[PDB]
Design an enzyme around this catalytic site. Sequence first.
Site, PDB file in Angstrom:
ATOM      1  N   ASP C  26       4.897  -3.129 -18.276  1.00 26.06           N
ATOM      2  CA  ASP C  26       5.789  -2.710 -19.818  1.00 26.06           C
ATOM      3  C   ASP C  26       6.931  -2.850 -19.908  1.00 26.06           C
ATOM      4  O   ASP C  26       7.562  -1.804 -18.757  1.00 26.06           O
ATOM      5  CB  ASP C  26       4.877  -1.025 -19.721  1.00 26.06           C
ATOM      6  N   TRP C  51       4.388   5.441 -13.563  1.00 22.34           N
ATOM      7  CA  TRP C  51       3.018   5.330 -13.571  1.00 22.34           C
ATOM      8  C   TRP C  51       3.091   4.312 -12.486  1.00 22.34           C
ATOM      9  O   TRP C  51       3.323   3.694 -11.867  1.00 22.34           O
ATOM     10  CB  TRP C  51       2.498   4.552 -15.009  1.00 22.34           C
ATOM     11  N   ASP C  70      11.323   2.396 -13.517  1.00 22.64           N
ATOM     12  CA  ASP C  70      12.689   2.261 -14.548  1.00 22.64           C
ATOM     13  C   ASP C  70      14.134   2.155 -13.661  1.00 22.64           C
ATOM     14  O   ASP C  70      14.304   3.684 -12.975  1.00 22.64           O
ATOM     15  CB  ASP C  70      11.864   2.762 -15.785  1.00 22.64           C
ATOM     16  N   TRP C 102       9.232   6.080 -18.206  1.00 25.27           N
ATOM     17  CA  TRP C 102       8.921   6.733 -16.959  1.00 25.27           C
ATOM     18  C   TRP C 102      10.477   6.435 -15.950  1.00 25.27           C
ATOM     19  O   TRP C 102      10.857   6.147 -15.617  1.00 25.27           O
ATOM     20  CB  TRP C 102       8.147   5.577 -15.969  1.00 25.27           C
ATOM     21  N   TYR C 113      15.692   2.603 -21.840  1.00 23.50           N
ATOM     22  CA  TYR C 113      14.652   1.905 -20.463  1.00 23.50           C
ATOM     23  C   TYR C 113      15.676   0.407 -20.542  1.00 23.50           C
ATOM     24  O   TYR C 113      15.962  -0.396 -21.809  1.00 23.50           O
ATOM     25  CB  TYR C 113      13.422   1.546 -21.423  1.00 23.50           C
ATOM     26  N   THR C 116      11.806  -2.650 -15.378  1.00 23.24           N
ATOM     27  CA  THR C 116      10.751  -1.827 -14.389  1.00 23.24           C
ATOM     28  C   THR C 116      10.725  -2.722 -13.062  1.00 23.24           C
ATOM     29  O   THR C 116      10.881  -3.790 -12.902  1.00 23.24           O
ATOM     30  CB  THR C 116       9.620  -1.859 -14.910  1.00 23.24           C
TER      31      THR C 116
END
Lengths: 376, 375, 125, 125, 357, 354
Positions: C26, C51, C70, C102, C113, C116
């Site tokens: 995500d 995750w 991340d 994360w 963020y 990822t």
Amino acid sequence: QETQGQAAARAAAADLAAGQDDEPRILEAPAPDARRVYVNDPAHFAAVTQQFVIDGEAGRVIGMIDGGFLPNPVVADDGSFIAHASTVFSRIARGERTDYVEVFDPVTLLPTADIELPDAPRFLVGTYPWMTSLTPDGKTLLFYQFSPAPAVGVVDLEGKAFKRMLDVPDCYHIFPTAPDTFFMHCRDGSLAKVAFGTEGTPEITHTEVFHPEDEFLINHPAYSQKAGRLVWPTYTGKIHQIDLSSGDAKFLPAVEALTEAERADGWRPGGWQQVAYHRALDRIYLLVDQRDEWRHKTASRFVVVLDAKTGERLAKFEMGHEIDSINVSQDEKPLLYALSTGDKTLYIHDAESGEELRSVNQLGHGPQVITTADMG
Amino acid sequence: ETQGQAAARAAAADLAAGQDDEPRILEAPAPDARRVYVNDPAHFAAVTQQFVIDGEAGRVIGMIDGGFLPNPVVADDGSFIAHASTVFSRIARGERTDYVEVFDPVTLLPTADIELPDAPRFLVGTYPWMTSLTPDGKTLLFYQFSPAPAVGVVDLEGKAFKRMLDVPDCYHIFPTAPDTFFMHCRDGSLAKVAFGTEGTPEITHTEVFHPEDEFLINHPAYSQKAGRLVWPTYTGKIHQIDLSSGDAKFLPAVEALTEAERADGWRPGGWQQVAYHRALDRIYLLVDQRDEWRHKTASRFVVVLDAKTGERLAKFEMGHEIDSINVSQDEKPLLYALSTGDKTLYIHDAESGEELRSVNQLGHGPQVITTADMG
Amino acid sequence: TDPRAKWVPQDNDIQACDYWRHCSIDGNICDCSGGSLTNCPPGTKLATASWVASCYNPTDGQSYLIAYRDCCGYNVSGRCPCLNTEGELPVYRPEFANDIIWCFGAEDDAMTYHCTISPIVGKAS
Amino acid sequence: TDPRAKWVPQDNDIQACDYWRHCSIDGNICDCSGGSLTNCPPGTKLATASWVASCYNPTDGQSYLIAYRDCCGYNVSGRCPCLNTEGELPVYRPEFANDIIWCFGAEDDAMTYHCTISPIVGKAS
Amino acid sequence: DDALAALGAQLFVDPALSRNATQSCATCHDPARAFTDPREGKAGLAVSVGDDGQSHGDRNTPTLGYAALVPAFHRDANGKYKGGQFWDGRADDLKQQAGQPMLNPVEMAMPDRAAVAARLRDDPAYRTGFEALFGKGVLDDPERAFDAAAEALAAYQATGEFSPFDSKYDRVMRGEEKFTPLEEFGYTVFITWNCRLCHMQRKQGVAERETFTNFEYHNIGLPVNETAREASGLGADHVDHGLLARPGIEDPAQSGRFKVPSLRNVAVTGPYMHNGVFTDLRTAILFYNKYTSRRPEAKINPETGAPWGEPEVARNLSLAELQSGLMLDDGRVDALVAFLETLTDRRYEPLLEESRA
Amino acid sequence: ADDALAALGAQLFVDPALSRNATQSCATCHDPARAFTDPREGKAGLAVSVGDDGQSHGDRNTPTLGYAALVPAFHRDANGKYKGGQFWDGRADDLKQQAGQPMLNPVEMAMPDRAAVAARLRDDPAYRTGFEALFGKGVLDDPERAFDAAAEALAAYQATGEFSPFDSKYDRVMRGEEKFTPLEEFGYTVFITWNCRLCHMQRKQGVAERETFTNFEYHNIGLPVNETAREASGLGADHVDHGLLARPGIEDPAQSGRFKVPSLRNVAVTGPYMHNGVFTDLRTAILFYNKYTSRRPEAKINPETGAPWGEPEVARNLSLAELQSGLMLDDGRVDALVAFLETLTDRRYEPLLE
Ligand code: HEC
Ligand code: HEC
Ligand code: HEC
Ligand code: HEC
Ligand SMILES: [Ca+2]
Ligand SMILES: [Ca+2]
Ligand code: NA
Ligand code: NA
Ligand code: NA
Ligand code: NA
């Protein structure tokens, strides 16, 4: 037929021809009412974000509020203020982090409080309305913390101060029921009731486990604080309802939002704010579509409406757009709001007939969260 | 194969071989003549982004965040990059802080963060030559418009703001020495501004080089190493000034468009409308047919002319709505063509004009292309 | 193209949202802002938290656990956005939940963020 | 709409980029974020500075000076963006120059750009 | 190959390799206890007693299970020290480690390579076995004999007996069994929490023979084990510098770092850490919450009811990995215990049932 | 009758019989040859005027009567602000209320009382006829009727096209009759975009039909005391001119130091400038505004004296929101503003410009 822009042009032209003088100034928004709706744009995780204050009756932006990283918006149900918990950094997205709560006057939109939260304690997550929550008297705001462990921060809005962090068990979300009490949903499938005084450990009590380990309750339940009604869909459109109005949880009969035949033809809820609840009509609204089982956060093109007492389907609307979030105004003859993250557009529908009445576009980069006040 | 395909094959091979690699923070490749920077002022948003791109591979190799309408600069020798930027304590409200950051061009980490007292930057849609480095790389100069035209002096080597310089009613900053730069004045002269570590600067004007009815665009090209200032007007007449000696020598004006083209509605238009290649001594100008007051709209064509004679060398049909252009300064250059509306940088062979590759998803409204002249 | 259709992994392009390791990503693919499949871009800080998802590799027919770590400390890259949710569970099962940022463990307390990465961390099972 | 064609004013819709008073607006129309043609939205700060343009009103045949004053202290609204440049001159003639953030004089030292209003301030000479 | 390993099998349980003939490798590395020491000494099971019946070590006797998978000591591609044998990696590999307990006066206490060679010369089956593999007169040369014995013992430790890969975990990975819901949750926590940063072989990808250690050296900030320190007789002033004790390592930044142990059979090889400071598995897991939890209980060792104690070496801690920003609630601790218990080899499952009780 | 009343006013305006010693009329201080201001030199130069006793000086500068008939009666506007009236401090509601005040002021025309005024009116047979045709038999035997009637006549005269001709270059340009020079045009543009517009234009937005370059509001721009005028007026070293707060009915201290924004029509020929005539030159009055915006040290100096401007007479209630615009006028824009202001000169006073 005439749009706001046209009406405005005509009025400006009449004023000019009449030689009317008027002082350029800062406008106040109209008084909050049942048809005001707020749309928050988390902007696909951008470091700064926007909230749009909208008159749902006119389909007109009446104001905006700036926010930081993944802010949590709240709206007092009686219309007296709005607030958010937000997060900024000293060099855009790097450097010293500051978490803070702002409270705003709902008509001037000026900030009336800016309350720092110590030690950067907010949970940074794609936005879930019930991860930050007002108590029914509007005097306390409670926010969720995940790191180092689940915890709930208590913010005094009246004395404009952070108070303290409460230790809780392995639980999530905050549904306040009283000045000193809220419920959470726990990993073990129980709710926790959390009752906190001014100092010392809160009193924590669990309900029965109300769902099994492999029934998945979505991140966006609907909660009517005035009704004490918590409406919690699962990934298949089964809907749990919990009545918290007595101060203790009573589990209502479960309802299915989809029929056995729809479920066998691939229908499942999907989106972000997938469920709405109208308190006076006691009705539930769910975003659904045909989808693979692990496409649960994609947009949906349909809304089913069901009677919350019987589970009887009342309507099924074809929305005509890719809708991620829904909500409703809480007045008689409510509006049904249907926000498209991809279109950056709020579509405003009659909740009775399903018909699109109007729409408000250019709502930021990735708008996701609709909030309304229940003023009734 | 595309970059993502080549990467998928590499990852598959390492998996099949049992290759272990530590996840870590990458360094960008060494700065080279084909690196290109694209700044996104994001249609006046409170925060903004810069994209560091390997122009040869068409690959983003890094980014740098910035605040409200920052001014980027790049050392010609590749040793650092820097910007002057502006933040506020509550998104776009509250206490304002203006600052300069200098960055290592391989790690992209900030090596200096220099506060500018009294929020002195000029907040304007981004013009490259409103903030400029001296040729020794030791000083950054930035423009101030309020309360009056002034120039701030920031010592990068001692990492400290120095002072504001009072100047006449003049605009832009074209440095020519460790202690000297030129500005364009409203009266139509340039002003030479020579500054000491204190004392008012010494200011002298050239002759007036254009009349009041010719409009010189906000985005001239300036090659510091050639000392050449290339300055188009709204009609595509191009002034050139030779600053290589340390003092202004005027060169003859050239017309980028023919008389018949002008009669048929051709005029420059866009944002960075002009580029200058030092080694080839060539000018590139974004042009299209347009109404006379549609000068900030995109252009679909580029003309290329010899800077010594004014002779047209090429006219390229760019095939996209281009707002800004620039060139790499190596012997066989790339011609960069940035479309604000497409948020995409198109990378062309400058000789043939042909599109070689593109880099999309460059923010919200990318506008400014910068390269280093490492030659 | 149909957003609601069952997601179909490929092993031929890591920048596309249907690359097999991206089954519960995500945000944005780091390889599109100067990182790589398993490294962060310059200037950003690599989280230690993640995750996880079990993602099937059509190349070798194995399911691997992908730890989505991340890269933090920069505003979101805005390139190669993707949101997939294979096996993705709500927030009260946070090891499988992908709306969370994360970024825990990243140097300099970085928590914003940027993108990822998709490294394999073990066999699924 | 051909972006390079001569701009044509109308007097029928203030939210469209061809409304006659927007002849040299750069930014966003305030009416689209809760202001009005000549008022700023709630929570923003009205500058006293402006750039000016002579704009022709097709309803009454007169040319008016419009003072493009900014509403400041909020991030850019993102609604109804327009950039027109009728008579617009480069920065060294700043009274006619519209890339400048014309926020000077705004309360609270506000200097970020939210949107622009289009009040008539005099007759064009 | 086979014959070398079979010689080492005999040597491994032969007490004639200790000065006064009271102990063999198997005494401290008991095959019934995942090759660790069940014998109670002055510090309980924290450290072991040598051939003279008094001398205690200052470190806990580690399992030999899976020790054959550890690479020889080296610097890896990331610049880090890796592999080797002993808690401080002071031996390069198994062959270099083997003769050390034999000559160590606090362990088997043989006076010298010559005295060991004399014992080997005594057993008729050793003269035959060694000469067939090493050539005639191998046993008449003390350094030849001593090298040959170490090589035999190293080969024996590389057999399937020591590394069978038949734990519940291994059976689950090939589909013969499934994790319980608790064990599954434990596997998921172990993989996504900071444990995976040190206790998995690879930084990314998959190991074909996973042993739940990256063979690196880390200072996790353990206190001195007071009763073991006393028993070992090394003194109130002593500091176990870990990897810095390896010859040719001089950098003070290595002080207090120890080799990450394989977690295979961890449920049956208590007590824990390089000095056996913690008796129970659950305590070893809770130790890591000292770096993450804000609750006052995270500061207290549940086995003593007192603070954990200051680190023996207060510098060089692996804080980037340890300060993960996330604390293990009790449900995740239970899940980690259940997961780690699946790493018990098959033949130790009845032993495990005893430790669980 | 409209004409008749104004023609009676025309007569009173130039009649020195309305002054105690009969040495002065309204036209002495408001001289038609100088845009209805005072050309006479006194103890403070042209800063303040000398009354009928040949000795008493006022403490404020005599303003033009041009365009004063376009000023609304004193009131509170739609935005909450005081606006209109006459005198620099708005203490008279309108022109009729203003007119009788110089007549009776012992520092000006110095008539002892209304009865004294009625008697001068009766002493003249042309007035008797003219007054009774308009107001009725016996109007001059009644001091308060006579005095009111005189004031009405003077007010009507000031409302004639003669005082407000609208024939400046600015007017001809706005009627499409000729163009500004480039300098005058730049000056108009500067005036309109810079803070001058906030006070010196009739309307907040839109266009006036009869623009007089003032919004008739009250502002303290922080001027210093004119020392030589203050000396001359004899009001004392401790006196403070409180501006609008002297108007009866205003009590709020926040009004102290605020004066009526003057029309800039004929400004180029009606120096010296401000309520106390402190600056002799038009350029100095424009440069004064730079004290609030410029960071150059020259901006703190009054160029007429080479010395600092001086502290405000009332250092409270300054219009800082308007004045602190964040922009300094360079010398080019000051030249442009002078060129523009000169175009507001009525045609008949153009010869006065050099
Ligand atoms: C008296 C008890 C005792 C005896 C007898 C003994 N050991 Fe050990 N063993 C230890 C202890 C204690 C350690 C850890 C010592 C250290 O780290 O400095 C150790 C460590 C080892 C290691 C290193 C394992 C690792 O993970 O680092 C190997 C291999 C080993 N022993 C093999 C042997 C062999 C082969 C023999 C027989 C020649 C033997 N041991 C005899 C107590 C003993
Ligand atoms: C930074 C590296 C690192 C991290 C992270 C880490 N460990 Fe360890 N672990 C070690 C080292 C090194 C030792 C041996 C320490 C010593 O004895 O000095 C160890 C010892 C252990 C032991 C005792 C094993 C034995 O034979 O004595 C257990 C159990 C353990 N770790 C479990 C975990 C779990 C569970 C986690 C995640 C909550 C974890 N560890 C996180 C490096 C780490
Ligand atoms: C001795 C000089 C003198 C004489 C004689 C005189 N005035 Fe004045 N006039 C002044 C001064 C000085 C002011 C400003 C006074 C103040 O603001 O307190 C003034 C102000 C005014 C104003 C207010 C204008 C404005 O902009 O506020 C009007 C109207 C006026 N005079 C009309 C008259 C009329 C009618 C007469 C004859 C009846 C008259 N004046 C006689 C000096 C004089
Ligand atoms: C805040 C309102 C305000 C602003 C802004 C303002 N003025 Fe004024 N101006 C006044 C007032 C009030 C006076 C009379 C002040 C006094 O005398 O006490 C005045 C007086 C003047 C006078 C003297 C006129 C006379 O008859 O004595 C000139 C010339 C003048 N202004 C020009 C300008 C120009 C040019 C600008 C723009 C640089 C400007 N003003 C900005 C309010 C303003
Ligand atoms: Ca042990
Ligand atoms: Ca005067
Ligand atoms: Na002990
Ligand atoms: Na050493
Ligand atoms: Na004087
Ligand atoms: Na008063």
